[PDB]
Amino acid sequence: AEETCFDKYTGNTYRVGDTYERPKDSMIWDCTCIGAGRGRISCTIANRCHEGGQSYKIGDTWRRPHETGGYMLECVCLGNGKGEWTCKPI
Numbered sequence: 001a002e003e004t005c006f007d008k009y010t011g012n013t014y015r016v017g018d019t020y021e022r023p024k025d026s027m028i029w030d031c032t033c034i035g036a037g038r039g040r041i042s043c044t045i046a047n048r049c050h051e052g053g054q055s056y057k058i059g060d061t062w063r064r065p066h067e068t069g070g071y072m073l074e075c076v077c078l079g080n081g082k083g084e085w086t087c088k089p090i
Contacts, residue, residue: 005033005041014041028055049077049085056085063090 029043056077075087
């Protein structure tokens with residue numbers, strides 16, 4: 001029988017090597033089923049930004065008012081292993 005990993009957040013089982021997203025609270029984790037006889041799962045946010053209660057992949061963009069409210073910004077998730085982002089007026 002094929003070995004699996006169980007994810008308590010998605011509520012699903014996965015097979016070894018399977019990759020998936022795990023929503024937990026305001027964040028989305030990139031997870032991989034390893035197994036190792038104990039359903040070992042490795043998850044990472046190293047490649048994501050988490051800002052304004054949303055989750056972004058590298059290069060994803062979002063729109064945000066400038067602090068003054070007079071104009072809209074576009075922000076991009078750069079990541080840099082550190083969840084970094086920047087914005088410019090558009």
